Every structure is written in structure tokens, then in C-alpha cells.
Amino acid sequence: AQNPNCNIMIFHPTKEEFNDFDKYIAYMESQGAHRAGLAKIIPPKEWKARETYDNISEILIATPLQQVASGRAGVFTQYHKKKKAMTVGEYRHLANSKKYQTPPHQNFEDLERKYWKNRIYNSPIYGADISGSLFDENTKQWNLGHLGTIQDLLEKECGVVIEGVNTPYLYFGMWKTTFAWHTEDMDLYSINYLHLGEPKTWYVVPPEHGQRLERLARELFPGSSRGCGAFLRHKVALISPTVLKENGIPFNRITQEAGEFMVTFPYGYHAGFNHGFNCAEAINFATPRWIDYGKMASQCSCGEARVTFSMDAFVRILQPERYDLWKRGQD
Ligand SMILES: O=C(O)CNC(=O)C(=O)O
Ligand SMILES: [Mg+2]
Ligand code: NI
Ligand SMILES: [Zn+2]
């Protein structure tokens, strides 16, 4: 078995290898990359996402989210308070202000220490989940707006044609902005490109160990667990690396820098934080190997998780027994 310790693997495809997206994902899996739940892909030196980032300031963040924490430094939840709209140029100036800017630090490990010590005492503002793309239309390789759709993959594997669409989302971050522990909708893959700015640190649990994280989460968030049998779908819970280590949970960590892609694999729990002002693009995708994960994915039916239009068909076709309860949670 390749990669039996489930380490995060880093790949350096050539420009030739960067042509065929599906083929390269399958290659990475042939080397065991998926066992980690996360991989890094450094694009060939010849590649670029677009020519410059000098003209993005007028993008609107219609609903910036203030991420307010509750709990203790290493075990907390966050809720998202909606703020007034602002442009990317206004958000960048806010990120760089004394109130929100990255503190002085020695290296990434020092900054990580400071994040986990102090995150809960601040409420950073995240421009998350903005439909759109920063890839140039002329970028033909790894253009996250031009991937094969999940509806086409389901149709190709299973023969059933379904409604729905699959488009990318932009994320504008600042110091301490946080993504809570989660797997993707329907345990899909994700791919994330860091277009510009400061790094993003990731934590990940191997898919074969995801139920160990779920059992810890139920212990640490006992009211939430009584409320919902899949409360991590709410995307609000944080657990620090120190607490994971104290509880024996297998995990790994890595820092993504501007110009790098990350892929999350089906049922790979992940969480993390931004180092300072940045912009990422991400989208879900599927392969043949996902279908079995989609069929087994947990679902939230309590009403909290509320998701896209296109998840309906996935539940309806892959999980017909669960469909009526899930759809009630949607309505
Ligand atoms: O960058 C973020 O805030 C969150 N991104 C993801 O969870 C992802 O790409 O799967
Ligand atoms: Mg603009
Ligand atoms: Ni994700
Ligand atoms: Zn729920």
C-alpha cells in the first residue's frame, strides 16, 4: 500500500503532466496521496493563473462575515456575524489596519503558536464564499472555472442525467480568519488555489481515521452533538493541534503559499487559518472513486447546514432512503 503513514504529499508536475487534470489526480492517488486527505501541487514554472492581480479592487464582498469565537483557546466554536458590504480594496485596507494586521513573528511555526494562543480574543472578518473566478479565460491548465462538472461525472459513471451546476468561489482572508473542521458536501473533493497574498495553514485527518475525529468532536461539543448527528456539517467547530495530540487523533499540517494548489480528498476532514490578507479560489469536483463516498456521506437534517441547489440531486440519486428527511432540513 502506498503512503501507509498517510503523510501529506507534495507534487511538482511538469508542463506536460499539467495538461490532463483527471489523469494527474489519478496519478497522485496511485502514489497514495489520498490517504493523507490533502495534497499540495506546485504548478510548473511556465504556468500562470492570470497576468496580474493589479485590477481586483473593485470586486464586491456583499456580505463580509465577522467570525466571533466562544469556548477555550484550543476548543471553540465560531459564529458568523454579517457586516455591511465592502469592496476588495476596502477589505484589504481593513486587513492591513492596526486592529487586524498580522503581528510580528519569526516564522510560520511562531505565527501558528500565536494563532492558537490568541485566536479566540479577536473577531476577524472573512470575505468567504463569493461566486466568481480569477483565472484568465486563456489559462487552459488547472483553470478552476473549466473543470468537468460533478453532474457530468455522476452521469458518466451512473448513467443518470441530473440538474445542477458547479462553479468556483472566491475567499478574501485576513489574519486569524478561520475555516472550521469539515469534509466537503457529499464528501466530494475540493481544490483550492491561493491566488495572492499571505499563506494559509491547513490541518487534515486521514479519511481512514475520520470517525476518530467525529467521536472526539461529540465529546468536546456535547450539546451540539445532541442537536444533530452530523453537526460538523455546520462548519463551526475548532479543535487545536495540541488537543488533537492529547486525544491521540491522527492528523497532519502544512502551509500553502501563494501560487500553490491544495486538493482535499473524499472524507478528508480539514481546518485552518489565514496568515494575513489573501485571496483563494476553490471548487468541488468528483472522480469515479468519489461515488462510493458520496453514497455513504453523512448528512445534517436539523436545518443548520443549508446548502446549494445542486446538492439535491446528489442526495436524491445516491441516498434515496435519506432524501425525504434531508429535504425537510432544507425547508
Ligand atoms: O480557504 C478556506 O477558507 C476554506 N477552503 C476549503 O475548505 C477548501 O478549499 O476545501
Ligand atoms: Mg476590480
Ligand atoms: Ni473544504
Ligand atoms: Zn445539523
Swiss-Prot record:
This enzyme's EC code(s): 1.14.11.66
- According to its UniProt record, where is this protein located? Nucleus
Keyword Transmembrane helix carried by entry? no
Q: Which residues does the record give as Zn(2+) binding sites?
A: C228, H234, C300, C302
What are the binding positions for 2-oxoglutarate in this chain? Y126, N192, K200, K235
Q: Where are the transmembrane segments?
A: none
Q: Spell out the family assignment given in the record's similarity comment.
A: Belongs to the JHDM3 histone demethylase family.
This one is known as Lysine-specific demethylase 4D
- Can you name the source organism? Homo sapiens (Human)
